[PDB]
Structure formats: structure tokens, C-alpha cells
Copies of this chain bind each other. A is one copy, B any other.
Amino acid sequence: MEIRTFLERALKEDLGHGDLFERVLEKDFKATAFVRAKQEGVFSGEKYALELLEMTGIECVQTIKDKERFKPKDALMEIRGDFSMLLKVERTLLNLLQHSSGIATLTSRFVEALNSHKVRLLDTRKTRPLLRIFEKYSVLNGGASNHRLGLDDALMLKDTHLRHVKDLKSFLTHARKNLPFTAKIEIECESFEEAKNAMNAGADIVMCDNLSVLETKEIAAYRDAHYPFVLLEASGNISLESINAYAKSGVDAISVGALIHQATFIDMHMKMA
């Protein structure tokens, strides 16, 4: 299964040489446990939790679904299996749920503020090591959309790249044959001129990086009139305070890496009996 190895590694780091408790547990037995919320938020991590339980021979009796909202004291999951295994898995289970839900929850807050159905919210490649796929998945559960998953997914030319590109148009024109047939090319721009030049060069997507709303609206209006098929993306420390403003700029999407890199754990715990 696609994420099985991920769960194996998550567990392995916690068990190390082997759980010490099972060495002294006088008698193992079947038991039921509940994952309860101690804070409100939106649920994420279901796909991983279920794969983890199945892998460890733990039964998932009941569980709320990804994207579902919850309140403190709410029971999020009911699991049953060997007492020794419920304990060996406890932390790994909670940590992945609290982290995933943390991202989904923070993300849902940005979805509300953005308040739009025409403009999608996006993440970035700023993700914690080994957690890209995990965290991208978590953003989906917050109600937003994902940007590319890696460096093979699409071509994104930013400031650093552009400095070594004499004549963008020529570059983009002859880059197509060396890129996979289905690849889009995005160009990071920091001024109306740059974006305009990007569009004329043959950019599939143009990012309006660190630009005022006015500056962005100008570029969006220009795009609508001359390059109707170029997607526009706004980004650059966009906050909960300014996200709505940019939603009205005319851009197609808005990316904020904070959805992932400023997310924190939603409080939860596991209780027996």
C-alpha cells in the first residue's frame, strides 16, 4: 500500500529495540480504546490511521471521516485489539492525527477568510522532511487545494533560475521538447513588467510574488484581456488578514506556505475502558 512504509517507519522510530512494557505485562488481553478530542478542529489523518491499525492488527470499530468537524470531548475513533499493541501504537496514532488535523484545521481557517468558490487556496513545497505527501494530503482535508507535489510534477522558474535565462521566450519555446509532454511551466514574477514578459514568453502559469493587491489586479486585468489562458497565482506572506483582499484581485489561486509550516498540533488523547 502506498503509505504502508511511511507508517512502518513512524512506528519503528518509537519502538526502537522494542517496547519495554510488553516485557513486564503479566497477561495481554483484548481491550477497547477511544481517541478523544480535547480541542475543536477538523479531522485529518484517517487514511493513515486506518492503514496503521490494520498493519498492527487493531480493529477500527468506529471513526469520523477526514474533513469532518469535531468539538472537545468528542470521540474521534473507537479501536479494539491487544492491550499491549494499543499502547505500542498510541503515540504514533495520536501524533499523526494531531499533526494532520492541525494542518487541516489551520487550513480551514484560511478557506473561510478567502471566502470564495472561484479562487482556490494552495500550499507550497515548504513541508517538513519526509512529510510532503502526508502534509499535502492534510491540506486537502482543510478544504483547500494542492500545488505541485515535487520538482518532477511541473517546472517552476523563479528568481534564481531566471538569472541564468537570457531570452525567456526562446527558452520556454525550446524547453517543451525536453520536458514531459504534459508539463506546465510557471514563472515567478515580482512586477507588472515581469509578469507581462512572462505571459508573452509563453508561461502556462504566472505567479504574482510579493505584490500589492493593486499591482496584482493590474496584472490580472492585463491577463484577462491578452492572455486569457494563463493561470495566475498570488503569493508572498499572504495572511488571514489580507487573504480576502487578494481573492478579489482576479487571480485564479492563492498560495500560502503557512497552511503547513505554521500549523501546530490539535490537542487529543487516548482513553481505555
Contact = CB atoms under 8 A, between A and B. Distances in A.
A36 interface: no
Nearest to A177: B145
Given A24-B179, A151-B20, A153-B16, A163 B129 contact: no
Integer count of this chain's copies in the complex: 6
Nearest to A237: B267
Interface stretch (A63-71, A130-138, A188-196, A212-220): A130-138
Contact of A95 (B128, B149, B177): B128
Given A20-B154, A147-B182, A265 B262 contact: yes
Interface stretch (A7-15, A72-80, A238-246): A7-15
A147 to B, nearest CB: 5
Interface in A239-261: 253, 255, 257, 261
B127 A153 contact: no
A83 B164 contact: yes
A271 to B, nearest CB: 8
Given A14-B150, A129-B96, A150-B13, A20 B177 contact: no
Interface of A: 1-2, 6, 9-10, 13-21, 23-24, 56, 83, 87-88, 91-92, 94-96, 98-99, 120, 122, 125-134, 140, 145-157, 160-161, 163-164, 171, 174-184, 186, 204-205, 229, 231, 233, 253, 255, 257, 261-265, 270-273
8 contacts: A17-B152, A19-B152, A95-B126, A126-B265, A129-B131, A145-B178, A156-B182, A181-B233
